[PDB]
Design a protein around this ligand. Structure first.
Ligand SMILES: *[C@@H]1O[C@H](CO)[C@@H](O[C@@H]2O[C@H](CO)[C@@H](O)[C@H](O)[C@H]2NC(C)=O)[C@H](O)[C@H]1NC(C)=O
Ligand SMILES: *[C@@H]1O[C@H](CO)[C@@H](O[C@@H]2O[C@H](CO)[C@@H](O)[C@H](O)[C@H]2NC(C)=O)[C@H](O)[C@H]1NC(C)=O
Ligand SMILES: *[C@@H]1O[C@H](CO)[C@@H](O[C@@H]2O[C@H](CO)[C@@H](O)[C@H](O)[C@H]2NC(C)=O)[C@H](O)[C@H]1NC(C)=O
Ligand SMILES: *[C@@H]1O[C@H](CO)[C@@H](O[C@@H]2O[C@H](CO)[C@@H](O)[C@H](O)[C@H]2NC(C)=O)[C@H](O)[C@H]1NC(C)=O
Lengths: 70, 49
């Protein structure tokens, strides 16, 4: 697990849930039942930069807007 | 300290402590980023207290 994810130089925190890794990819899950979803901009919120969080990790946070606009 | 409040409802589930304290702030109305950007201050204040 990791407390936050870095994307575009910004720190992303979960709205509800924890970040988990299955060995090769990272997902967001709810805390009481294992049910992974992809980490998006609708699942998370932004606060601060990736210089203050200890243990923050690099990953991709997917924006739904751009693949709709091709 | 190692399992939070999970051992009282079943099996003890490990979770790192910094992340336990962030959950505990959420439970009182404080966002979790307030802890993670001030982690050193809260640890210093707790240890002196
Ligand atoms: C972690 O889960 C992912 C997703 O299930 C696994 O990665 C593969 O992901 C591609 C899409 O990018 C799928 O088409 C494959 O079916 C996935 N493979 C498997 C076996 O599920 C990845 O293998 C998992 N990692 C580990 C260590 O099990
Ligand atoms: C968790 O603790 C382990 C040690 O038990 C840390 O692993 C060390 O990481 C440093 C760099 O930060 C390396 O120089 C050491 O060689 C590592 N030790 C071993 C035994 O491999 C690990 O970094 C810690 N994780 C976090 C997020 O702080
Ligand atoms: C996570 O990704 C960021 C962005 O690519 C990495 O920041 C770079 O760090 C290297 C040194 O490791 C520097 O030489 C670059 O200048 C940094 N890039 C930027 C844009 O600042 C960061 O190191 C990555 N974290 C890990 C653990 O690999
Ligand atoms: C919040 O209040 C604490 C004190 O309760 C401030 O921390 C102290 O700051 C002074 C001045 O820099 C230091 O001399 C003390 O050693 C600090 N105390 C501890 C326990 O670290 C803290 O700076 C305040 N935060 C803000 C943003 O003003």
């Amino acid at each position: 697990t990791a407390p936050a994810i870095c994307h575009d130089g910004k720190a992303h925190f979960p709205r509800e849930g924890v970040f988990v890794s299955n060995g090769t990819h990272w997902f967001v899950t709810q805390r009481n039942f294992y049910e992974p979803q992809i980490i998006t901009t609708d699942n998370t919120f932004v606060s601060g930069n990736c210089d203050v969080v200890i243990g923050i990790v690099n990953n991709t946070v997917y924006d739904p807007l751009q693949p709709e606009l091709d | 300290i190692t399992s939070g409040w999970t051992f009282g409802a079943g099996p003890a589930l490990q979770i790192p402590f910094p992340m336990q304290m962030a959950y505990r702030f959420n439970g009182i109305g404080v966002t979790q980023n307030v802890l993670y950007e001030n982690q050193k201050l809260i640890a210093n204040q707790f240890n002196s207290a």
